[PDB]
Amino acid sequence: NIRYSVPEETDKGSFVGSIAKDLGLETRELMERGIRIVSRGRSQLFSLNPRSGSLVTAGRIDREELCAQSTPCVVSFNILMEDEMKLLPIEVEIIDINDNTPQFQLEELELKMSEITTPGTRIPLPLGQDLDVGINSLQSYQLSANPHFSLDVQQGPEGPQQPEMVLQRPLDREKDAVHYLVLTASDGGSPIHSGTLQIHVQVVDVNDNPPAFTKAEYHVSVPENVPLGTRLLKVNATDPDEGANGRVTYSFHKVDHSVVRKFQLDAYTGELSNKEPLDFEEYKVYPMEIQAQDGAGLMARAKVLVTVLDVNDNAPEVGITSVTNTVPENFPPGTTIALISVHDQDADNNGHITCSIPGNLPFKLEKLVDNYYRLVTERTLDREQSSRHNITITATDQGTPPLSTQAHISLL
Amino acid sequence: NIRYSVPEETDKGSFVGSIAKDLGLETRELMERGIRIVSRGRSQLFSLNPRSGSLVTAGRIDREELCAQSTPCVVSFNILMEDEMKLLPIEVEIIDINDNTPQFQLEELELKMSEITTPGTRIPLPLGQDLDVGINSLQSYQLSANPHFSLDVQQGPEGPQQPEMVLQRPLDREKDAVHYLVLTASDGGSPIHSGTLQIHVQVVDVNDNPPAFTKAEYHVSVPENVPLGTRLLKVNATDPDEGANGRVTYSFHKVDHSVVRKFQLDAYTGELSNKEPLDFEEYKVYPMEIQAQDGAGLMARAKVLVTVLDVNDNAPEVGITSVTNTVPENFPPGTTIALISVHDQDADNNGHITCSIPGNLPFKLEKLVDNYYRLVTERTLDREQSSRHNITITATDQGTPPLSTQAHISLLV
Ligand SMILES: *[C@@H]1O[C@H](CO)[C@@H](O[C@@H]2O[C@H](CO)[C@@H](O[C@@H]3O[C@H](CO)[C@@H](O)[C@H](O)[C@@H]3O)[C@H](O)[C@H]2NC(C)=O)[C@H](O)[C@H]1NC(C)=O
Ligand SMILES: *[C@@H]1O[C@H](CO)[C@@H](O)[C@H](O)[C@H]1NC(C)=O
Ligand SMILES: *[C@@H]1O[C@H](CO)[C@@H](O)[C@H](O)[C@H]1NC(C)=O
Ligand SMILES: *[C@@H]1O[C@H](CO)[C@@H](O)[C@H](O)[C@H]1NC(C)=O
Ligand SMILES: *[C@H]1O[C@H](CO)[C@@H](O)[C@H](O)[C@@H]1O
Ligand SMILES: *[C@H]1O[C@H](CO)[C@@H](O)[C@H](O)[C@@H]1O
Ligand SMILES: *[C@H]1O[C@H](CO)[C@@H](O)[C@H](O)[C@@H]1O
Ligand SMILES: *[C@H]1O[C@H](CO)[C@@H](O)[C@H](O)[C@@H]1O
Ligand SMILES: [Ca+2]
Ligand SMILES: [Ca+2]
Ligand SMILES: [Ca+2]
Ligand SMILES: [Ca+2]
Ligand SMILES: [Ca+2]
Ligand SMILES: [Ca+2]
Ligand SMILES: [Ca+2]
Ligand SMILES: [Ca+2]
Ligand SMILES: [Ca+2]
Ligand SMILES: [Ca+2]
Ligand SMILES: [Ca+2]
Ligand SMILES: [Ca+2]
Ligand SMILES: [Ca+2]
Ligand SMILES: [Ca+2]
Ligand SMILES: [Ca+2]
Ligand SMILES: [Ca+2]
Ligand SMILES: [Ca+2]
Ligand SMILES: [Ca+2]
């Protein structure tokens, strides 16, 4: 049993072993025995020269073609010596070399992972196969640098097995929606042959962000006589989510509908304008809470305060709250014939009321408490001179433009 | 200024105070004064009888109609004494009673809140309005018991303002999709009247649950001769989420496609069957990783092991690795004429190799190293008796049913 060692992929005619030296044969003795190689499929790679006694290579010795993945790879063929008709077992071990690159069964691996994927989730990676064996076979995986993922390689007896990609830092689609990684598989030769696997990690969206107003409280000041449908304000709300999770619509929070009903907020543009007249008397200010809803149950809040300014638009009102229609012929000076109830719905200088009566007639109005005015007479009237009187009392407020209300009293 | 006090909703003619008693005037003296009602806009609700000297009520005194929510509610009107022509204002305070229930401006407040809503979110609630005043006005809010929500009321000097509903424990649509609450507003009378506002909080779905397999590792044993397309297994994964987030689709994890390519997995029904033949050789077992995907990027993993049974289906193979065709006429007994290399691809009793040669001829086969067989000579054959030889060697394996391979070798003298 003769055993040699030759690397694989040798050049044609490369020396393997000299049979002459190990059998003790010269050139002549080899010629006399008539040594020649016994053929079978595999011995076609080996060539025996009967004069030099040197078994050399006859062709390409691709050990991956011969033994695939086994070790060691030894080719056994018989040498026929015609003299004694003697067979001689020659076994030649094929040492492995590195001439192949690890091949992934694809070029781009595309995966879908939600942004709420719990960190630590594992993804088995495609296996890369190095055609060589031994030290020139698959030796290591390397995941391209990225904060969100890490590489986990199980140490196996034959080599690295079952590569896995682990989620480290939690995903955020609003920051990075697509992560490109590169899984490089490398053997252990010199130089090292690396096969690359492109990884396309796509992040799926989840409604995790409610709208956000530009201001927490929206203030505005408006005249009371402001016409209907005047644009009071425009709010602004943003949503960073994708698609239906990021389309906002505004609406009124059901607070006090007696206040909300006096206003109008466009659901799409968010422009608040007035729908009903604005009266300073009932409401000086208008507090309202507004709401912005996206498409998936999230919402945001904001406050809107509509302060009403005052301008003279309400005239005082005079109520004929007292009338003594029958007034004596001999009444003394200082007797009240009528008491009136005066009231202006406005404030400041626009809300004070003065009383006016024609000054020729004897009776006059004096100052009394709380816009009440007492009509007391200052002289005597003749029974013959005046039988019937149709008097016109004038109540004017003092804020320009002044507003006035008249009351007419008939007396006898 | 004389001030009296009468409650609201009094019967007609009810006593307040005797004006004759307070003015120190008798029945006659006031009649001489000519005391009479000064008739203000709302003064007809007051009735003065000019004989008893007691200004009493004339009708229903509904102060909620009078002063609404103001305080205090005092009615001022003048008493005219015709004697000195002197006016005297009488003020009567209207004492409040409880005849109204707090009324909400709607019947059901319905809201949509995502299951991922950050706890602590506040929702201003619709105001309930009690027409009464004082202690008979709105006094308290009460939110019905619920683990996820609580009531927060801002108090005022007069009473409660801006009731707000706060989310405490985070919502789960997979557990509770609809929450019904009852907001009761109550005054402070005796008995207390409560108005109710039904609340309908709907929870919107969010992909917060990954698939879940029924088994972590799927083991199965199938004969090697199994035909193509035979149903091997069925996996099952459930998801409690709603809609597209809760129906699963199965697929192979991209690991080794040389193993996956030999199989077929329906993505929807999840029934695994074979697509290519299964040979016990090359692969004794078949390990595979499977993946369950919902509709929104979540996934689950499971293992499936398809173990191949072993069956005698590969016959041993005989290789004529050596043949010395030229053989002397006078060769002695014991000389090898041919060496054969036989090999069976199975194991155990199905993998042991036996050799058979014609027993009439002198040559016989003896076993040497491992699986090699040597054709040795035992006697002499005459060239005249036999010039050419067509040999039939049959190799049989030892596992039932036995498989045999025949080889024919031609030799001459
Ligand atoms: C030793 O002798 C045997 C016969 O005893 C030889 O085997 C024979 O080989 C021939 C092929 O040349 C077979 O012919 C076959 O005919 C059938 C008819 O249907 C068909 O299958 C094919 O057309 C085929 O040619 C013949 O059947 C076969 N003998 C037997 C019994 O099956 C053998 O070749 C001889 N070996 C040597 C080294 O001389
Ligand atoms: C306000 O909203 C508009 C509408 O998209 C947007 O363009 C703008 O950026 C927002 N305001 C700010 C300060 O970004
Ligand atoms: C004075 O007022 C009374 C009130 O009814 C009316 O009837 C009368 O016609 C008025 N005087 C004149 C001259 O019109
Ligand atoms: C298996 O999946 C089906 C699919 O709807 C389901 O009906 C069944 O409940 C699942 N298995 C069990 C044990 O529930
Ligand atoms: C592995 O390393 C080789 C060099 O040995 C590169 O060519 C390859 O791209 C990978 O980075
Ligand atoms: C990995 O690297 C190879 C070259 O080694 C490229 O061809 C491939 O596209 C991937 O980037
Ligand atoms: C408020 O309280 C009253 C009793 O005071 C109940 O009748 C009502 O249903 C609500 O609970
Ligand atoms: C609360 O209770 C009132 C009765 O007080 C109902 O009318 C309402 O629908 C809610 O159930
Ligand atoms: Ca090679
Ligand atoms: Ca290599
Ligand atoms: Ca190699
Ligand atoms: Ca996010
Ligand atoms: Ca998102
Ligand atoms: Ca959103
Ligand atoms: Ca006004
Ligand atoms: Ca005014
Ligand atoms: Ca005004
Ligand atoms: Ca009442
Ligand atoms: Ca009440
Ligand atoms: Ca009341
Ligand atoms: Ca949930
Ligand atoms: Ca869900
Ligand atoms: Ca899901
Ligand atoms: Ca088989
Ligand atoms: Ca088998
Ligand atoms: Ca077998």
Author numbering:
A (entry chain B): 2 to 413
B (entry chain A): 2 to 414
The authors write:
The γA1EC1–4 crystal structure contained four molecules in the asymmetric unit: Two of which are arranged in an EC1–4-mediated antiparallel dimer, with all four EC domains involved in the dimer interaction (chains A and B); and two are arranged in an EC2–3-mediated antiparallel dimer, in which EC1 and EC4 are not involved in the dimer interaction (chains C and D). Since there are no protein domains filling the gap between EC1 and EC4 of chains C and D in the crystal, it is unclear why these domains do not interact. The fully engaged EC1–4-mediated dimer is similar to that of γB2EC1–5 and γB7EC1–4 and the published α- and β-Pcdh EC1–4-mediated dimers, involving the same interacting face of the molecule, however the RMSDs are quite large (4.3–5.0 Å; Figure 1—source data 3), highlighting the architectural differences between the γA1EC1–4 dimer and those of other Pcdh subtypes. However, AUC of these fragments showed that all three were monomeric in solution, like the EC1–3 fragments of β1 and γC5. The absence of this interaction in some of the γA crystal structures is therefore likely an artifact of crystallization, perhaps due to crystallization condition, although it does imply that the EC1:EC4 interaction is not particularly stable.
By contrast, in vertebrates the clustered protocadherins (Pcdhs) provide analogous cell-surface diversity, but in this case generated through stochastic alternative promoter choice. Biophysical measurements with domain-deleted proteins showed that Pcdhs also interact in cis, through a membrane-proximal dimer interface involving extracellular cadherin domain 6 (EC6) and potentially EC5. The specificity-determining cell-cell recognition interface of Pcdhs involves domains EC1–4, as shown experimentally through mutagenesis analysis and suggested by mutation correlation analysis.
